Structure formats: structure tokens, C-alpha cells
Amino acid sequence: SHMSTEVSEAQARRAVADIFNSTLASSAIGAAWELGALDELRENGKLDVSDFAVRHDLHEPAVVGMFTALASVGIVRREGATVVVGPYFDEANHHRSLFHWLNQGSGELFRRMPQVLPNENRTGKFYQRDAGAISYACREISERYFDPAFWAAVDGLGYTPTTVADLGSGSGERLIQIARRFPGVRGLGVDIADGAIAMAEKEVAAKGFGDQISFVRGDARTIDQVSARGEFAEVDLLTCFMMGHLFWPRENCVQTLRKLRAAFPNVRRFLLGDATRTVGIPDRELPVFTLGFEFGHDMMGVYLPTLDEWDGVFEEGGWRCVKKHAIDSLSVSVVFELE
Amino acid sequence: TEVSEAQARRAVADIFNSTLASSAIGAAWELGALDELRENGKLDVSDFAVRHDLHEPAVVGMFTALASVGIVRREGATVVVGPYFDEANHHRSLFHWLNQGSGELFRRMPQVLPNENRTGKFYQRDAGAISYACREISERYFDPAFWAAVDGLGYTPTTVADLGSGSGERLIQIARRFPGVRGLGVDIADGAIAMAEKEVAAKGFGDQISFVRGDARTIDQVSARGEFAEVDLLTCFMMGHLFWPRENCVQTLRKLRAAFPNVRRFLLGDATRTVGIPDRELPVFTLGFEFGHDMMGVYLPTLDEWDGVFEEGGWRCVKKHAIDSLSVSVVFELE
Ligand SMILES: Nc1ncnc2c1ncn2[C@@H]1O[C@H](CSCC[C@H](N)C(=O)O)[C@@H](O)[C@H]1O
Ligand SMILES: Nc1ncnc2c1ncn2[C@@H]1O[C@H](CSCC[C@H](N)C(=O)O)[C@@H](O)[C@H]1O
Ligand SMILES: C[C@@H](C(=O)C(=O)O)c1ccccc1
Ligand SMILES: C[C@@H](C(=O)C(=O)O)c1ccccc1
Ligand SMILES: O=C(O)[C@H](O)Cc1ccccc1
Ligand SMILES: O=C(O)[C@H](O)Cc1ccccc1
Ligand SMILES: [Ca+2]
Ligand SMILES: [Ca+2]
Ligand SMILES: [Ca+2]
Ligand SMILES: [Ca+2]
């Protein structure tokens, strides 16, 4: 019962006010997550704003602002000095990493819409995002949205692996969680990013897997041109989550898939997981993330393959898709079990 | 408090999408799209992208964000104004302010709230962007009350001073209305001064209107060549809250009094902090203005606070105008 074309002035005032306050609420979701407040509310159901502000050493006027923003749209409810969870808390909290990703992570790009859209401006470094904030968001995105299907695919391997290479390894939590499932297994993360190596080795060292899991720097689209080559022969499980769309355009994907095939010829299973572009979803029925993901990629000039485009690329890439998993529900996201 | 799981999905999806809508409104305003939709009721994105030399897929995204909350509707490459177009287009400059102007502040909420961080230049805003939005906010929301106040001055100014002069447009319009008038702008920012000097010169007012770099809070320290004595009309719009806290405001009001001994009327327009509006009934702007200033550590007075400060500050409020409707905003006529 949504799509009217004609409304009262009163309705339009309220609607436009809501969009405005949604913006502040949106940013506040990610911030309340990162400052601990969404967790207190999840656990205790309620909190005392002054008490919260003191405990965490926060400027209280601004802390009232954050909660009022959440409350302007029903995520929480304010009662005197108390904030309780509101009718929309669970959903918002479930998707809190997506909001963080939108604001804290990608705000700078969406803010500069008017500078970024002009063609004369689109070369070299023409936008900025917060790498550390994205990383922070993508850690929970990976867990909350991709783990079930990732683990489901690991359960369906039909063999117990021995050496697992992970493309776009970032934090290293993927490899680490593998280590624990398959006691003896060794691992080899790969990034095109320097602070991913360090953050990982530190986190690896921090959990007792230093002796096994090592890392490397290299663009995974040209993995043959990476000095770790020699060890790629012993690897019997490849993985690649939240970065496959970078392999594109199509022809560069084909190439990259082919080159990966040769560089890892002992790989039995290759688990590939990513979000895809949607098609034909109606403007007023777009779910969370979809618009953010697609629109931001369109602004960065980065290509986003639809799900069909992935499907029709694997053969030529030198791979066969033997199982496919739908993600709940990070737009249209998928896990492919390739071999 | 009780809703279905599907209502909840939809509402959270709307909040997410609104974020991108909010940002798009300011972009669309800036890039010509809203003006083009006011006139023709429609627009073609291919046509549009081309005319403006913009990356069309990003242009489609922009319009899909606005379509996603009913500001416009899409019919293939044909955008038609939506059910909320008039209201959104009306407040476009407020959305601009929120996102393009003040986006970096609200983005860094996690870094900006911890007291430890609250020293130095702990936040950032886009001066160019903000300035760009305040031009329209000034004209769209304050002008009616502003010109009503000028009509009922009870005299005709000979020399006007404008505090936080910005673009210089207020002084230009004053000169258009009163052709013999001398004009004087104080702004604390070299960039405003330079821009205003430009515009004033370009338009042919270089003789009448001139500018000095200054902090209106300590107006008593601004050299100005003795010209403050000749001023008989004082204007100050959209910066008065920076006089606060209260003891500072009383002081700044006494110093304005003294620096401008021949001012007959002092016209002061600002938005104020509201009280007791229920969370789910906040109108546009109110939350962003208040929340942002709390984040920046800047005091925002209520209207009653303003009313209660004038006497101790050396002035008598003789006329008050309500503004429609930029949160609770007002123009005071002081003497
Ligand atoms: N072409 C490329 N080659 C190697 N690494 C890349 C890359 N493009 C992006 N990356 C890296 O991939 C990571 C994206 S986030 C990775 C999430 C991780 N797979 C997880 O689910 O926990 C970042 O660390 C980024 O630096
Ligand atoms: N202490 C201070 N003294 C003088 N100007 C100040 C100030 N603090 C901020 N400003 C200026 O006040 C302006 C806010 S924008 C308002 C512009 C103008 N009053 C108008 O009606 O359109 C900016 O130009 C800023 O540089
Ligand atoms: C990492 C992020 C992404 O592509 C981006 O931030 O550009 C992403 C990828 C896939 C699913 C969710 C988020
Ligand atoms: C200039 C702006 C403001 O306070 C700010 O940008 O910080 C403002 C003041 C008063 C009414 C509307 C906007
Ligand atoms: O082509 C597809 O639809 C998927 O890429 C993989 C798949 C194919 C056939 C049977 C199962 C999975
Ligand atoms: O105190 C007030 O109410 C206003 O600040 C000024 C005013 C007072 C009386 C008559 C008109 C205006
Ligand atoms: Ca298919
Ligand atoms: Ca000074
Ligand atoms: Ca002087
Ligand atoms: Ca009063």
C-alpha cells in the first residue's frame, strides 16, 4: 500500500522530515554500534543516558543527540533519563554493520556526489573512503551474512583440507576459523593491502596459529606475478569472499579465473562469495544495502556483475559450479562452490 | 512498539535509503536537476547527464535514491516529479547543509563524542559547501521576515553594518532597495571577505559597500577606520548563537552597543534550540541543527533565553517575527 502519486501537504511534510531525520539516525546506528550502546540495549533492554555518557567518557549533550536521532525514527524510545529499545531495534541492530558501512565507511563518497558525478573530475584519486572504518564494518558483514553459507560449503567439501589459500584475506578471521575446524591445517592469506597483513599476523599470533598461517602482498587478479608462486602447489582449498566483483570487467574475470586455476592446480574446491547487482527491483521496494552497494559502485566507476553474469563466466574461466547458496539477505548475495 | 517483522524490515530499509536520498537532494539541487524538475515536471537522465557532462550510471543512482523515497518517480530514463517533490525541493538547502555542508561532522560521531578527543580541530566541515547552502537558507527562510522588518524600521538607513556578512548579498540587496546607502560587512573568514569584495565589485557597488575581517564576538577589537560610529542599522543573521553561552552573550551585546553608538535598530535573525517536541514529530532541520551544535560543543539558546538576555546586554526588543518554518526561528528587532 505504498506508491501514491498525490498526498496532503501534511503527509509530505512528515515524509520529508522523516528522510531528514533518517540521515541522522542512519549515521547514529553505526556510531552507537561502535561506541557500545547497541550492545547494552540488546543485552539490558534499556539504559540510562547520563550513566552511559560517564562510563564511556562521552560528551553528554551529543550522546543525547545520538539517542534522539535513533528515537526520531523508532529504533529506540526515550523516557526521561532512560532509553529503551523501540519497535525497530532488532532489525536495525541486525543490519548495523550495513549502516556503518554506509556512513562511517563510505560517507565521504556519498557526501561528494556533486563533485564525483562530473566526468572532468573522474580520473586518478577522485574520491575517498575510510579504509579502517570499512574494514571494521566488513568484519561483521563477513561474519553475520556470509558465515552460514561459508560453513555449509565447508561441510560439503568431501575432503578434509591441508593447505588453504584465501584471496582478499583482510583481517584473517577466515583462515583463523578454518584452523580451529581442521586442527592441523596450514593457511596462506593474500591482500593488495599492507595493514591487512599486519592486522592479520598480529591477530593470528594472538590466537596460537603463528607457526601455520603466513600471508603475502599481491594483486589477486595477477597472482602468477606474486613471489609466493612455489608454495601454491600444495594448496587444496581456495577461498575468496567480498572481493570477486573487482575481478571484473568480464574479460579480466575470465583471465583471472584461468590464471588462478593454473596457479592453484591442486585445488579441489574454490569457495567464492560476494554481493551482486540486482535487476528490476522497484524503486520503492528496495531493501537494505542494495541501493548503497550498487549506487556507490557506480560512483567509484567500479563494475558490479549480476548473478547471471557470474554464472555465465565460470566455464570460460576454467571452473565448474557445483553448488550455489543464496545469502539472507544482503541484497542478492551468493556463495558459489566451484571446482 | 509492536510491529510485524515485515514492517520493521521496510522501515529500516527506508531509513537506509533515506540516507542516500538525503544526500542526493543536495546533489540534485547543485547539479541543476531540481530546478529542471520544478520547471518542466520531468527530465531525461541521458539528456541530463549529457548536458551536464556527468557519468550517467551515477546519475541514474542519484535519481533512484530520490525515487526510493517518493521524491521522484522513474519511468525508464524519464524522471517525473514525485509526491514529495515540492516539499523536498522547498527544503533542498537544508538537506544540502546536512550532508554536503556538515556530512563529515556526523560521519565521525564515533570519534567526536569521546571527551578525550574534544581538543583542537576535532571536527571538520565544508566551509564552501556550508556557505553555498546558507545563501538559499538566508533567502528562502529569512527574507520575508527580514524585509518586513526593513519596511517597519521607522526610518531609512544611511549606513548599515552586517555581521557575518558572508557572500555580501544582504548588503547588496540593501543597496538595491536604498540606493544612497553605505554598506559595511564584518566576517571572520578571509574567504567570505574575498568572495564578497568580488561580488560587490562585479555588480558595481565597490563604491558603496566595503568589508573588514573580524570576530563579531569581540566586535570592540575591530579597527574599521571609525566607520562604526556612522552606522545607524545593524544586521546579523544566522550567527547569533555563537555569542552564547549567556555571560558571553551579555558581554558581546554590551560591546555591540558601544561599538555602534548610533545604531537605531539591530536586526537579529537566527534559529533556536527547541524544547519538548516529541521525538517522532520532529520537523525538518531541528534535529540536525541541535545535534550538530551539541557535537561541535557550541551553545544553542532557546527563544526564551534570547528574550531574557536583551536587557542585561543593553538592548530593548521592540518587535519579534516568527519564521515559517526552519525549526523555531525568529527575527528580533532590537534598539
Ligand atoms: N585485487 C585484490 N587483490 C588482493 N586483495 C584485495 C584486492 N582487492 C581488495 N583486496 C583486499 O580484500 C579485502 C576486502 S575485505 C575481505 C573480507 C574477508 N575476506 C572476510 O570475509 O573476512 C581487503 O583486505 C582488501 O585490501
Ligand atoms: N565570530 C564571527 N564573527 C563574524 N563572522 C562570523 C563569526 N563566526 C562565523 N562568522 C561568519 O558568519 C557567516 C555564517 S553564514 C551567514 C551569512 C549571512 N549572515 C547571511 O545571512 O546569508 C560565515 O560567513 C562565517 O564566516
Ligand atoms: C566490501 C564491500 C564492498 O564491495 C565495498 O565496500 O566496496 C562489500 C562487498 C560485498 C558485500 C558487502 C560489502
Ligand atoms: C549557519 C547555520 C549554523 O548554525 C551552522 O552551519 O552551524 C544556521 C544557523 C541558523 C539557521 C540556519 C542555519
Ligand atoms: O550456473 C549456475 O547457476 C551457478 O554458477 C553454479 C551452479 C550451476 C549448476 C548447478 C549448481 C550450481
Ligand atoms: O522578549 C521578547 O518577547 C522579545 O525578545 C522581544 C519583544 C518584546 C516585546 C514586544 C516585541 C518584541
Ligand atoms: Ca543462473
Ligand atoms: Ca577581532
Ligand atoms: Ca571603528
Ligand atoms: Ca519569552
Ligand SMILES: [Fe+3]
Ligand atoms: Fe566493492
Ligand SMILES: [Fe+3]
Ligand atoms: Fe552554527
